[model samples]
Target chain A: SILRLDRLRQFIGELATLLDSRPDESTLLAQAHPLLAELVHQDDWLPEDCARPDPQRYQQYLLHVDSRQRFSVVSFVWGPGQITPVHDHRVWGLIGMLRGAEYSQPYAFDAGGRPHPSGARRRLEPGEVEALSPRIGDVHQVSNAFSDRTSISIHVYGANIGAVRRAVFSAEGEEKPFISGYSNSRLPNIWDLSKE
Target chain B: SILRLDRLRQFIGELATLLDSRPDESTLLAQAHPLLAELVHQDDWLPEDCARPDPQRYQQYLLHVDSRQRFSVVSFVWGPGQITPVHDHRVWGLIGMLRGAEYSQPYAFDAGGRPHPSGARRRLEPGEVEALSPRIGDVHQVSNAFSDRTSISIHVYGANIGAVRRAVFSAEGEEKPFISGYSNSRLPNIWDLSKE
Candidate 1:
């Protein structure tokens, strides 16, 4: 007998099943945290296309999206010293470190509407996870912890993240709306199982 | 609007639709040859994991398989100087060269059941296509044309080829029943589209 398996496929199946139940946002993120953790725990299944970091900037490659647009999976490839502006995801999301490390610095608005560091910068090593939503802390800037190599992370969001209308914050706390489109036009054919 | 496309995924979608019509083998291969040609014409879509050649042996990585097992797509990765024994695919198949080159030498059984070279060896360069089956010449040995570099081709078969009972012939024409399972344990997650 021949056995075929893919960790990403299994994780997507589990996530879709979890979403099918129509769980609350908190429950969904809580349940999905472990699933994303398991996926990042073993780093072999990610297609090389999704893990490539651009020399000019960080790259975000889409991994999967629910049929109903209820969720999405993306791989964030961080080149050495690359960092994101403080941004917010309107819906719930989970971030799992897959390789190397990342530092996420949370930001909050002060009484005078200026942005300030709300908490200590948190570092995520491989296999570690963090959760986010508007309900919790949602505004943060993320950077590759390493200055001489690449860092990558697996992120699962409550919507097609690239298409979502979101905002990035400036130091003065002004919000600029933008859609962070994907870095690659071609997607990985993860569903094609003829090779298995 | 952001557009996400995958040539391999489109080929599989077209193939699955063709299978849904339940067309005969001849019609399916005739229609599929061009589709596979288009896929191999562009070498960028194949995930790096599927295109890797093992130094110890040639590698066969599955790209996609129909849900009903009507067909399978595989990437054959040949390390320098690697070759396959004279073998037969009981079902119809199409081979489209994707990268580098390969030479296929056809063979036939002579009067005393000894194997003999049946035709001149054919070299397939990138974007070239070849057909094979019991109806056509199926007994052949394939080798990477280059001795210093790797070669790869996309093979589409009428059935889940790895699981099908088949045979390889020795120079003396002795046949041993065997099944050629895939060289990969984890399949590419082509179905995961969240990244799009």
Candidate 2:
């Protein structure tokens, strides 16, 4: 959708401003969720090499990290059929589809409630965004809707997401605690400094 | 100088913390100045195309802008002798040389002593950093020191610098006020979106 970096900057700036006002959780989710509709666009906001996919799993690139602000901007890419284990998030989360489609299936209970279907699945197209909060969304599984092509989603979390000790649900509805590391295996940090 | 992006993130996070503590100007500059030495260095922090120098004047690539925090991180690029008007800043300033060199000449009054050299000029090589404050440093000018190479300095300020109305001095020792604009004419906000 949007290709301009300033568009994202201005949008994030507005979000930062809204965050400055310190809105409550639901208000924060309501206000912040809308911004990602534009924030998740396929743009030149990163380097061209960002298009490369991971061979083993979905790629999670650290786009921006505001530790003091207790939030981070991450890009998650999915190859065909790539999916996440049924999981629970401790903090508020925002997910926006950038390319292709993402099928989000919301779950009600951990493993105990999962033996039964709780609700319907949500299918998000490119440029679409949704919110997940402690009150509403703590358990869900997301996967690329396509079996032929790759998909990328932009995610913003309320904490250092990759390091946050969260929960994974087993097929029998058992909870196993774990920290999901980012798939930034070869991501470079601050390089090519001959002066630009 | 700052080598890794995580280090920069940690440093900036600390800066945000310090800013939240509401430290006074001198304490802010005193504590803040030393952090710049590690802030300036050649690395993979940015893309290769980031090495492109501005043709007309200097280019300013916005590194981070915190509107609510009332601070911004900008990379100022000075190409071969690019200079600024003799000016005075309204806020405490931190400058760090990332690549090439910079010659800083500090001037005295138009509080109004005018048109003369007030202090010794400092030439900053890569990795060197200096602070400018209201009580001690009010009048000065900075320019690229080399004729053939481009110089880049990373600056963090307490306000939206480009929008700040500041003072520009004249040859006759008169004051001409001005607001310096950023040179990010064509700089994009975000880049590549594949993942990392």
Candidate 3:
């Protein structure tokens, strides 16, 4: 039978065309958000290694990166009670809920330069999508909504997000710069068409 | 897990690039034959519907047609002991064996204008590839080599082969011009990337 990966490849082609137009950050997110949502809606293509959550923490598996380095797609696999430190993606991003729901808590810097909760914790169900950019609220902490299940979300960022310089914040708003590398050593073999 | 359709999409993109170069027919077949072979080696991506053999006859499923009408891809599905009428593809073509095995008997015109066997009937096993063209030999009859199993071959043609004027041969070489349309009503949904 046909591989579900067909949808992901289709999405990549369409998104590349959109990016080739050199749309502004907002336009890119507006046009690409639905594309990401469409890819995650099927939920049958993620490779098993990428979908497997780490025993002690969440796993961020890189699905693909544009040749031009304009964007990257990743799948975040979360075990029960897994949560991310308050982090910020300096560039634009879209997160599509795939396997399960997750809660995101947005934060804003106080006058004293400390991060504080600034918005309600939002729950994202499967097939739903949300956008992020520095212009909007980009600082947030994410956690699996369920404590008894593994959840997965597909994320698309304006740049190769893992390689981009970003930051994590402490409760007191102490910023510690970090680059989040992918959890897996290999990427999905989408381009290798030659027979062995 | 990832689907094998990813390889098909990759092959399509690569072949489009090659066709856009406008290589001569021989050059095209020489270059594209290996690409088709690479596609059939795994044999995991053929959708069940496309691989289904008919009780009364073999099935020819149209897998994809280039938007420019430059080429088309198809899968020929044969049930046990199934065979084809001697036919010609007016344009160049390549056949990649995906499952089981088949026999292709080449044909040529006799001095009296009757059809005669031209060359040895070639048996193609899985993962093997063969080429055809008017410049070479185009007329042939194909059969599933096994009496108890099905066989399938993936074909690529320089033009939309199904819609082109072609002919089936009689022993007397009487030509009845006919256009062989596709066996399936729907093509693979390779471009639909929206949430459903």
* Model 3 CAPRI quality: incorrect
> Considering TM-score, which of the candidate structures 2 and 3 is the better prediction for this target?
2
Model 1: docking quality category: incorrect
lDDT of 2 by residue, B1-196 (tens): 2224565665677777777667888888788776666656544464334456877888766565553536767788887878987888887789888788888888876555476666788999877778777677777888889988888778887776766778898877878867666544323322222222
Report the first chain's TM-score for all candidates: 0.95, 0.84, 0.95
Residue B130 Cα positional deviation in candidate 2, in Å, after optimal superposition: 4.8
Per-residue lDDT for B72-138 in model 1, tens only? 7899999999989888889988899988999998888988877788779899999998777678787
- Largest TM-score belongs to which candidate? 2
Model 3 agreement with the true structure over B51-150: per-residue lDDT tens digits: 8988898887877655344677888999999988888888888889999999999888877878888779899999998888788777888899999998
Candidate DockQ scores, in order: 0.04, 0.13, 0.03
Candidate 2 CAPRI level: incorrect
lDDT of 3 by residue, A36-134 (tens): 888988778876777897779798887766534567788899999899999899998899999878999999988888998887999999999999999
Report, to 2 decimal places, the DockQ of model 2. 0.13
lDDT against true structure, model 1: 0.81
Q: On residues A1-196, what C-alpha lDDT tens digit does candidate 1 reach at each position?
A: 3222368777877887787678998898889888888988877787776789898989988776554456778899999999998888898999999899999998899887888889799999999999999998898988999999989999988887887888999888888987887776555655444454
Q: Pick by DockQ: which candidate is best?
A: 2
Error of 2 at B162 (Å): 8.9
lDDT by candidate, in order shown: 0.81, 0.70, 0.79
